[PDB]
């Protein structure tokens, strides 16, 4: 009859069950740009060679 | 001419002062007196509380207080006020047809956005800025380091070329000559475009979806559901909202917070909300909406719930009830309550454009700082010319 | 409406005061600053160079021969690239923002009040033998007399008439129309004023005069509304899928830019003519 | 304007305009008239506006590309009204 879902969402429910509801706006770290930085370093090395 | 207590604060002598009352309820009462002719003597209740069934210090006795304490004791004959109708109030007195339909809701202080001075450089980390600057300097020096020893570009020329290509300006018109320098310049231009494109993308990401606290989803908000020390939310003590919170069983944990913090009247609560002392105020939709219309920095966000209406009550048996109900229904039928709503509720000044001047005043400040440092730079250039 | 109102382009992104100030005074001050740096070559050439490097790359112009002037133009070009990036981001956000429109607002609109003074007569009516018709007749007899021509038969008939287009407005009970709009597919039907209500009345359970059941029924209804049963009953029945929730832009969205450019080369042509007469 | 200047052919002007529209950087189309240069400047600003609008509209188009509208279980509104 469906009382179980109501009772578990009234008692067993939690606050951490959203899991896909944060804007999480943030900056760019060093490691994220480290890829193109390493590409640039390799370009410099090949220019020298 | 309405007589009332002078001081709302408890512990003070409440002398009956003859102030003057006006507004929605007063005009409605005047209209009712015009319909059926009867002289009215308006006075304010001694205690600002609306009136709830309260267990006095004397046990085994339920007592009505406030304006209902005035009315049921025979000290009043009719009440005109934004009084919420509920079961407890309907048990002891009979209410007329509602003159304003409304419901409970939440008012919160609107969080005006704050713009810091580092808004322009916000998307990139300070460490990232330092790394890209050091990379700029080292590649710029090694351009002419490689070009100088090429039998088949100087300090200033290579430096300005580097700044121009990383800057999408073209300040340095001198060009690399050796093939390795040409490939190096092309790769540096590509890296500069990648940097600027990623920085534009990060501005786009940060600018959009910019809301630190989304909203309160009525009463079902999980943050509102769980009481906490920082999230201080309250309502007017000893009123209809208190009765509704107490009686309905599931909400009783919310009631556990209620007695922790309360305010004597709605004015004190809204002042506390304005002064950021309260995080949320629970009150009637009409009052809070009017306050938001007037207090333009406060917003009503909670979903409308507990739908009811403001009613004018009298004693258990009164000859007026049928006639006053008929007259108020007639007033609803014609264009009268709309006029009152227009002239007492509807009018407003602001209720609530992007990237204003205050948003990134940092860029103009940086340009001004460059302008005022240009004199220092030209002085340094003159001093270098002296040497 | 077929096409909702389009929010203004390039007005929200930058304030007009900001527009004029950072297109006039900042440029003038920077030009005065760079000309003295170059002197210690021409005001006009420096102004043209700085204006060209404001927006983006153009045909190369002679670069300043002073190092401090080069520093100044570089720190200006930093502001230039941040201006370009911000002008991309703010239009992106403004594209993200939604849009909505209401055809008419309120019942006291002149379209309702005087349907005669319009080239197309306004089509509105209601089902007779109801509270809405009696209220309209008691308040505005002329409205009732006019709507008798455009009368309706039933609720579904009115909805299909609005869908086809035979009728323009349908006045009826607020709850019924709200339910119909919520359940309607495509949400092509909407209330005026975003839930505007005029009669602000309710539904009551009729009873015989002096019936003993009045007090008990009233107490039961108050108990139900105070225990919140009305809320889940409304969610079960009165909930509508339409309420409580611009891929591309056309030429008209950017028409202001095109017209500004039109005035731009018009001013250029008149400046050319003025220069020729001045030389003459 | 350049032809009637008091003091660059049609193809050169065409290539100037095309290099204004798209930032190739070929240049080599500098006009000699005052009004011609200022018009090229303002037209370059308008070309920047056009390309920025293109980028913004493309971003808006490709950020949201969900026509599927995945069913949210039994709570999906489409289930209520078949
Ligand atoms: C309520 O209004 C009704 C309608 O006017 C009143 O009934 C009339 O009262 C007058 C004077 O008492 C009589 O002359 C009429 O014959 C009555 N008509 C009817 C149809 O009853 C009634 O008196 C009013 N009651 C109150 C308490 O104001
Ligand atoms: C509103 O009431 C009138 C009055 O009864 C209805 O008019 C009747 O309509 C039926 C069917 O067309 C006829 O058989 C009767 O002779 C009509 N009576 C009169 C007095 O004209 C009308 O149909 C009702 N309208 C609605 C929408 O219910
Ligand atoms: C009411 O109180 C105010 C200040 O508390 C005072 O100025 C005023 O005189 C009082 N009213 C009367 C009638 O004394
Ligand atoms: C006004 O009051 C008088 C008595 O004071 C009463 O006779 C009359 O019915 C009332 N209503 C009127 C005059 O409309
Ligand atoms: C557009 O307008 C016509 C009437 O001109 C109407 O029939 C139609 O429903 C409207 N909407 C669409 C999507 O065509």
Numbering used by the authors:
A (entry chain B): 785 to 833
B (entry chain A): 435 to 586, 601 to 800, 806 to 840
C (entry chain D): 540 to 579, 599 to 803, 809 to 843
D (entry chain C): 580 to 586, 601 to 675
What wording appears in the published article?
Canonical N-methyl-d-aspartate receptors (NMDARs) are glutamate-gated glycine-dependent ion channels abundant in the central nervous system. Their activation results in excitatory currents that underlie synaptic plasticity, cognitive integration, and memory formation. Each heterodimer consists of an obligatory GluN1 subunit plus a homologous GluN2 or GluN3 subunit, such that functional receptors comprise two GluN1 and two GluN2/3 subunits.
Whole-cell currents recorded from human embryonic kidney (HEK) 293 cells expressing M817VEM or ΔMEM receptors revealed large nondesensitizing currents and the ΔMEM receptors were constitutively active. The conformations of GluN1 in the pre-M1 region are identical in both primed and open structures, consistent with GNE-4123 stabilizing an expanded outer gating ring at the upper leaflet of the membrane and lowering the energy required to break the M3 helix. Therefore, we used the M817VEM structure as our reference.
